[PDB]
Amino acid sequence: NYNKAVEEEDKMTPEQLAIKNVGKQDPKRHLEEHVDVLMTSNIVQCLAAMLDTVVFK
Amino acid sequence: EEKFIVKATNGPRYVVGCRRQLDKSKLKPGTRVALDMTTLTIMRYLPRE
Amino acid sequence: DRLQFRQPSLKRSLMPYFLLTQAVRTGNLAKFNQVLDQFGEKFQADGTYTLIIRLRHNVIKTGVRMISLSYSRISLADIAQKLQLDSPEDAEFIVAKAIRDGVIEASINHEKGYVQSKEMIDIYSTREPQLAFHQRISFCLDIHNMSVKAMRFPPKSYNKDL
Amino acid sequence: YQEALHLGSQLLRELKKMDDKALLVEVQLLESKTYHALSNLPKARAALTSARTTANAIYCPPKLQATLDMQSGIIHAAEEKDWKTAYSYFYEAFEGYDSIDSPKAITSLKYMLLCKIMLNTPEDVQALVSGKLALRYAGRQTEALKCVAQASKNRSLADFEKALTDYRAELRDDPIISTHLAKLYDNLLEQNLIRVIEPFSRVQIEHISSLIKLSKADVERKLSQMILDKKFHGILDQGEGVLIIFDEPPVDKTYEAALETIQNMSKVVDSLYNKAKKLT
Amino acid sequence: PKNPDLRIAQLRFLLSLPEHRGDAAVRDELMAAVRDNNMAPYYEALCKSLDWQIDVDLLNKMKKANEDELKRLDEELEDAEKNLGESEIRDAMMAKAEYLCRIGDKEGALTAFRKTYDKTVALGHRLDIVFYLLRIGLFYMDNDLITRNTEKAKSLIEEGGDWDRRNRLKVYQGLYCVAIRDFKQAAELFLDTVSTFTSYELMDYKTFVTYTVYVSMIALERPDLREKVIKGAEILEVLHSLPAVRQYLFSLYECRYSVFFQSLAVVEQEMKKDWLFAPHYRYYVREMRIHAYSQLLESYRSLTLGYMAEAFGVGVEFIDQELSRFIAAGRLHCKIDKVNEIVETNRPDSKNWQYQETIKKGDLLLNRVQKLSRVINM
Amino acid sequence: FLEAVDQNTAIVGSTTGSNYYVRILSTIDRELLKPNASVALHKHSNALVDVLPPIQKQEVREAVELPLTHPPRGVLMYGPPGCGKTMLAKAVAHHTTAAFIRVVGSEFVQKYLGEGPRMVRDVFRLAKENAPAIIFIDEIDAIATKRFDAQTGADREVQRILLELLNQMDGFDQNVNVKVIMATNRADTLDPALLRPGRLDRKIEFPLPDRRQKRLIFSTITSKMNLSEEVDLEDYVARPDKISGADINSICQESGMLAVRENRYIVLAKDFEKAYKTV
Amino acid sequence: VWEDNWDDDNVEDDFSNQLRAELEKHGYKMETS
Amino acid sequence: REELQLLQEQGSYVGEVVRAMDKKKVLVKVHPEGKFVVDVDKNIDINDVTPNCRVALRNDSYTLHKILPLDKQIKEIKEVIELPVKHQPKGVLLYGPPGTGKTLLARAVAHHTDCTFIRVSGSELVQKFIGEGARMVRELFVMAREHAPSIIFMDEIDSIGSSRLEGGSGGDSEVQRTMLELLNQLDGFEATKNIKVIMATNRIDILDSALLRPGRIDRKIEFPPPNEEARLDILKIHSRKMNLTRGINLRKIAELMPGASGAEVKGVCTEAGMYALRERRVHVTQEDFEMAVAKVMQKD
C-alpha cells in the first residue's frame, strides 16, 4: 500500500523529469525506502531455507 | 493508541508512552492522569473533583 | 488473413485463394479436394503444383494439429467420423506420437470395443505445484537476477569517468 | 402513459401560472400515479413534493388529500426504505377514507395490512381483523391477507402457494404490489433455503426437497440466480447433485500485485520513451 | 447535415445491398429527392437506382436552382463583407457551408468550414463547427477526420458541460464507440440518457435507445445491468414503447432460452440492414452466445444433456460442436467431460489462476526488460 | 512554528512564548515548513521529527438539492413576523446527508483582526475540501452595517472580510463543491453589494400579516375543516382591523385545541369568540 | 482495434462457406431435432 | 553527530537589536527577564548589524550569527478608448440602472485592449502599499506611468445611497474632488498615453457633476432604460453569458421589457434559466424570455 502510494507520484515523475531535467527540488529520494522495503521482504526468502531445514530434519 | 498527548498544569504540553503494567481502560482521553519526572512514565490516574 | 491492410489489390489478387485458404482450417478432404480442382486455375497453374500437391496431403497434418490444439483424447465414432478417418490404428498411433512429445498426456482403454478415456487434462493447479513452477521460480530469478546485474553494471559504466 | 404524462406535464407548465391552483392537485396526483405506473421513484418524489408544496396552502376536500398520503406510502413502499413512515401515511390515508367509500376503505385497510405484513408482524394483523371497527368492512379481500398472515406466522410455503392458487380468481386484479408479494415469497423462500441448505454441505436434492414437497425447477432457477448474484458461496449440480462450498480469503494480494504490475508497466514504457527520445 | 436528408440519404445501405426492401427506400428517396437539394447524392449513387428515363427530367431544374441559391448566397456573402461585424459574416459563410452540406460537396464546405473555422470568436462556436463536420462525417463514415477535430476541440473547454451540447458530444461518442468494437469504455457513455431529448438532427430517441440496448444488453453483465439499467427508471419508462425489448431483457435476465431462441430471429434480422450497425452483426451474436453460455455455465459445474437440451430446445449434435469450438476457440472454461454424456467442468481459475493472472505481464515484462538490456551500450 | 528565514534553517516559538532559533534536521523535507503548523521539538535536543495534525419548501428544495448534485447558490429569506430559519435548515439538514456549517453571523467578530481571514479561510477550506458543506450564515444585518470612523475599526475590518468572502464567492460562482445559504430578518439595512443579482438568485418570500393573505388563509383554513351556516367572516375580518394581531393561523389552531375536547361535533362562534377572549 | 479482427475474422470467415447465420434455421430445427 | 552537541545546547534564543553602542558592546533586546548586552562574535562585523531588526542569538555564547527578516456602446467607445490604441478624451460617464454595463464594459473593452484595470478602492491596504502619505492622486499616476495602459473606474462609490445632498455633497465631493484634481493633472500635462478615467453615478450627483463640469472636457454616452436599442445591446450582453440560439429575434423581446429599470432584464435572464433547465433545454429561447417577462411584470 505504501509502494503504490509512492508509485502514484512516480507516475507523475516522468513529466517533470521529461520537462526540466535541471536541478532537484524534492528532498525525497524514493529509492532507499524501497530498498528497505525489499530488506523487510527478504525475510521470507531467508527463512524459507529455515523452514526447509525444520521440515527436512 | 499506545502514545498520546498530555497537558500539564503549568502550561507546557508534552507526550508520554504506555507502561507495561497499566491497560487501555484508564488510557482513554478525558481522564486526568499522573506522570513521572524520569522517562515521563504513568503510575496511575487522578480522579477529578 | 488480411487484417491491418486495406487496399483494393490484395483483395482481388486473393479472391480465388480465399475460399481455400479459409478451407484449410476446417480440413475437409473429399469436398475441398474437388473444390480445389473445380475452379482452380492460377494457384495450381503456377507451375509443377509442388506445394499444393504437398498441401493436399498436408490437410490431414494441419487437421491433426488443429486436434493437437483441440481436445487431446480421441473417440472412436464422434471425432474419428468427424475427421473422415475411421481407423483405430493410426488414430492411437498418432495420438501416442503426441503423448511421447511431452506437451500433453492421454490414455487408451478398451472395454467393449470403443476407446474410453478419463480425459483428465487438469492443469498443475493443486497438483504438485512446487515441482511444477520450481524451475519457473529458479529461471525467473536467474533472468531477473542477471537483470539486476544489468542495472548494477551500467551505473559503474556511468561513474567510471567521474 | 407516455403521451399522457408528457402532455399533462406540458399542461402543468402553462397551468402553474393560471389561477385556482386547486385543480392542479388532480393532474399532479395522476402524475404521481403514472410515474408509479412507469416505476419512476425520483420524479415521483419531485412531483410529489410539488403536490405537497401545492396542497400545503390549498385545503381541498380529503378526497384528494388522503390519496396523496396513500400514494406517498406506495412510493416509499416501492423502495422499502422505512415501513414505519409509510405505515403512517397509510394510516392517515385510512383516516381520510374512513366511512366515505366501501371499496376505498377495504383497499385502504388492505394497503395497511400489506405495508404492515411486509415487515413480518402478523400480530397486528390479527389485532386489526379481531377488532369490531374493521370487522364491518371485512370481506373476500381480507381473507387472502389472513392467509398471507397465517402463512407468515406458520412459516409455511406450500400454504402460501395455496393462498396464491385458490384466491387467484381475488389476486387476479392485484395491483403492481404483486412484485412486492413475490419479493415476500422469495424472502421466505430465501429463509428456508438458507435454513436447510446451510447445515447440509453435501446432501441429496430429493432428501432436502421432500420436506418442501415442491419441484426442483423453480427452486433450482432461484438458487442458480442467487449464486449468479454472488450473495454466498455455493454451486448447484444436475447430473450428480453434489453441493460444494468454498471461498478464497486472500483477495487483497492479487489486486495489489496486479495494480503494481499495471502501474509499473507504464513506468518501464515511459523509461523506454525517455531513452528512445534521448537516443534516436 | 441536420436535415432529414441525412437519414433519407442514409437508407442507401438497405437501398443498395438487399433487393426486397429496395422499394420503400427508393420511394421516399425519389419522393424526398426534391428536398434539401438531394441532386448530387442520388446522382452519385445513381448506379444503385433506376434507369435514366425520369432521371434527366429534374436534373435541369436542380442544376439551375443550385446555381441560383449558390449565387444568392454569394451575393449575400459579398453584401456582408467589407462591413464591421463578426456574426454576420459567420452566418453568411456558415449558411453557404450548410447549403454546400445539403448538396453534399465537402470541398467548398471544407474550405468554407475552414474559413469560418478560423473566424471562430469563441470555442463554443468552434465546437459547433466541429459538430457541423460530424453530422456529415456520419454520412461519409470517415475515421480520422471525425476524431481530429474532436481530439483538438475536446480539451480547453473552460465553460462547463451544457445540457445538450456536451450530451450531444456524448451521443457522438456513442456513435463512434458503437462503430468501433470498444465496449468497456462505451458502457459508461449512455448514463446521461436522462438529459437526452428527441433530436431529429442525427438520431431519434427511440433509435438511440434501440441502438444502445444492444451494447448495454450484451456489453454488460448481470450486476452492471442491475445497478445501471434495472435500478434506473429509464428502461422502466421506455419499455412500454416496444413490448419486444421487455421480452429480450426479462428473458435474458430470467435465463429462459426457449423464448430467447424462438424470438432471436427478430434480433438477427433487425441487427443487419443498418447503416453503422450492420457490419458488426457477427460480433454481437457470438459475444452474446458465449456470454449466455458463460452465464448459465458459471453457476453450473456439471450439466447433463437432458436438462441442457430441454433448456435450450436444440439438438445435442449442434451444442456438441458449439462447445467443441468455444472451448478451444472461445476459451471460456477448462476441459469438458464426456465419459457419461454429461458436461462436467472443474474451472480452477480462482485459487491458482487468480495468482497466475500476472504471469503474462511477467513474461511480457521479461521481454521488455530484455529490451532494456538491449538499450544498454547501444 | 512562526517563520522560515531561509533553507534548512528557521525559527520556532516555544510554548512559553519565547522564540527559539534551532536549525532543522536534514531528513525532514520542505513539507513540514508550513508557517501555521503544530511543530514538536525534543525536550533536550530540541529537534523536530514530525508535525501534528490540527412554494417556500419547493424553492428551497429545488434551489439547494438540485444544484448540489446536478446552479445558483443562495436562498436568502425575509419576513420578520414569522420565526422560520429552523424548519428549512433542519429540513435540508435531515433530507440531504452532507456537511452543514451553522454559525451565527457574528462568528468572526473577535479582538484580533487577523484571526478573521484565518477562521473563515479554515471554514471555507474544510467546506471546499472536506465535503460539500452547506454553510448557513444567519442574521447578516449585524455585519452588514457600514462605518467610516476609526474607533470602531473592527467592524469595518470584519466587513472588509465580508467583502473578501464576497469576492471569494465570485471565485466560487462556477464549479465549486460548496453551497452558501443565508437567512436574515431585515433587508432594509443590507447593502446592495450583497443582494446584487448573480450572487443570491433566490428571493423567497413568505406570506404576511397583510389582510389579503389573511382572508385567503381564512378561506383556505375553513375549506378543510367542517363549517356551518352560523360561521360568519365579515365580523371576524372587520374586528382584526380594530384589534391587530399576528399568527392568526396559530389562533385558529388554538380554537382547534379548544374544540378538540370531543364535546361538540361542529365548531361554532362560541369557541371562536371564546378563543378570541382567552387567547 | 485489429486484435479482435483475428477472432471475428476466424469465426466470420470460418462460417462464410456454409451455415453463415444459422439463427433463422433453429426455428425449423426445433421440431425436427 | 558533531551537531548533536548543538542540539544538547537546549536551543538558542531570537535576539532583536534596538541600539548599537560605539564601545563594540551592542545591547540586544530579548524576551522579558533578558536584555543581555554582549559583544558579538569575532567573525561577524558590528557595523553590518543594523538596529531595529531581529537577529539570531545563542542562549549561552550570546553570539550573533546573521540578520533575520454593447454594440451600440462599443461602437461609440472604440473612438474614445481605442483611439489612442489603434487609431484626447479626458473622461466618460454612463449613468443608469446599475444592472450591467458599468463594469463588464470597462473590463470587457479593457480585456480586448490587453490593458490592466486599476480601481480606486478607498480602504486600508492601499494607502500603505502605494506610498506612505501624499495627496493620493500622484502615486497612482506614477503607477500609471510605469504601466501606461490602464483603465480607471469608480465602482465602490457607485450606489444609490448618496441622495441626501447634505452629507453626500462633501463625502461624495471627496472623490469628486479627487477626479477634479486628476482631470487637472490629465488636462495639465502627460508623460505617457493611455491614461483615462471613467465616472459612475446613479443619482442627482450626475447633475451635480454637470455643475462641476459645465461641458468643458467630458464624453457623454448615456444609457437610458426607456430606450429600445439600450435594451438590444445590454440584452446582447445578457446573451453572451448563457447559451443562445442563432434563430432568435432580439427586437420585440428587447422592446417588451419596459417599466422600472434595466435590471429587469437581469430578472428575465436569472428567472429564465430556471425555465430553461426546467424545460430541459440547452439554450434559452425567445418564448422562454417572454414567459420570464410575464413572470417579472406580473409582480409590478
Swiss-Prot record, chain A:
Widely expressed. Highest levels in heart and skeletal muscle. The modification Phosphothreonine is found at residue 13. Transmembrane segments: none annotated. Component of the 19S proteasome regulatory particle complex. The 26S proteasome consists of a 20S core particle (CP) and two 19S regulatory subunits (RP). The regulatory particle is made of a lid composed of 9 subunits including PSMD4, a base containing 6 ATPases and few additional components. Within the complex, PSMD4 interacts with subunit PSMD7 through their respective MPN domain. Interacts with TXNL1. Belongs to the peptidase M67A family. PSMD14 subfamily. Component of the 26S proteasome, a multiprotein complex involved in the ATP-dependent degradation of ubiquitinated proteins. This complex plays a key role in the maintenance of protein homeostasis by removing misfolded or damaged proteins, which could impair cellular functions, and by removing proteins whose functions are no longer required. Therefore, the proteasome participates in numerous cellular processes, including cell cycle progression, apoptosis, or DNA damage repair. This is 26S proteasome non-ATPase regulatory subunit 14. The chain holds residues 254 to 310 of 310 of the full protein.
Curated annotation (Swiss-Prot), chain C:
Keywords: Isopeptide bond, Phosphoprotein, Proteasome, Ubl conjugation. GO terms for molecular function: enzyme regulator activity. Residues 1-122 form the PCI domain. GO terms for cellular component: cytosol; extracellular exosome; extracellular region; ficolin-1-rich granule lumen; membrane; nucleoplasm; nucleus; proteasome accessory complex. The modification Phosphoserine is found at residues 75, 87. One of its GO terms (biological process) is regulation of protein catabolic process. Component of the 19S proteasome regulatory particle complex. The 26S proteasome consists of a 20S core particle (CP) and two 19S regulatory subunits (RP). The regulatory particle is made of a lid composed of 9 subunits including PSMD3, a base containing 6 ATPases and few additional components. Interacts with UBQLN1 (via ubiquitin-like domain). Interacts with ERCC6. Component of the 26S proteasome, a multiprotein complex involved in the ATP-dependent degradation of ubiquitinated proteins. This complex plays a key role in the maintenance of protein homeostasis by removing misfolded or damaged proteins, which could impair cellular functions, and by removing proteins whose functions are no longer required. Therefore, the proteasome participates in numerous cellular processes, including cell cycle progression, apoptosis, or DNA damage repair. Belongs to the proteasome subunit S3 family. This is 26S proteasome non-ATPase regulatory subunit 3.
From Swiss-Prot, chain G:
GO terms for cellular component: cytosol; integrator complex; nucleoplasm; proteasome complex; proteasome regulatory particle, lid subcomplex; protein-containing complex. It is found in: Nucleus. Keywords: Nucleus, Proteasome. GO terms for biological process: double-strand break repair via homologous recombination; mRNA export from nucleus; proteasome assembly; proteasome-mediated ubiquitin-dependent protein catabolic process. Disulfide bonds: none annotated. Coiled coil: none annotated. Expressed in limb bud, craniofacial primordia and skin. Signal peptide: none annotated. Component of the 19S proteasome regulatory particle complex. The 26S proteasome consists of a 20S core particle (CP) and two 19S regulatory subunits (RP). The regulatory particle is made of a lid composed of 9 subunits including SEM1, a base containing 6 ATPases and few additional components. Belongs to the TREX-2 complex (transcription and export complex 2), composed of at least ENY2, GANP, PCID2, SEM1, and either centrin CETN2 or CETN3. Component of the homologous recombination repair (HR) complex composed of ERCC5/XPG, BRCA2, PALB2, DSS1 and RAD51. Interacts with the C-terminal of BRCA2. Belongs to the DSS1/SEM1 family. This is 26S proteasome complex subunit SEM1. It comes from Homo sapiens (Human). The lineage of its organism: Eukaryota, Metazoa, Chordata, Craniata, Vertebrata. The gene is SEM1.
Curated annotation (Swiss-Prot), chain H:
It comes from the Eukaryota. The modification N6-acetyllysine is found at residue 128. GO terms for biological process: negative regulation of DNA-templated transcription; negative regulation of programmed cell death; positive regulation of DNA-templated transcription; positive regulation of inclusion body assembly; positive regulation of proteasomal protein catabolic process; proteasome-mediated ubiquitin-dependent protein catabolic process; regulation of transcription by RNA polymerase II. One of its GO terms (molecular function) is general transcription initiation factor binding. The modification Phosphoserine is found at residue 61. Residues 92-300 are annotated as: May mediate interaction with PRPF9. The keyword Ribonucleoprotein does not apply. Keywords: Acetylation, ATP-binding, Cytoplasm, Nucleotide-binding, Nucleus, Phosphoprotein, Proteasome. ATP binds at residues 96-103. Belongs to the AAA ATPase family. Component of the 26S proteasome, a multiprotein complex involved in the ATP-dependent degradation of ubiquitinated proteins. This complex plays a key role in the maintenance of protein homeostasis by removing misfolded or damaged proteins, which could impair cellular functions, and by removing proteins whose functions are no longer required. Therefore, the proteasome participates in numerous cellular processes, including cell cycle progression, apoptosis, or DNA damage repair. This is 26S proteasome regulatory subunit 8. The chain holds residues 60 to 394 of 406 of the full protein.
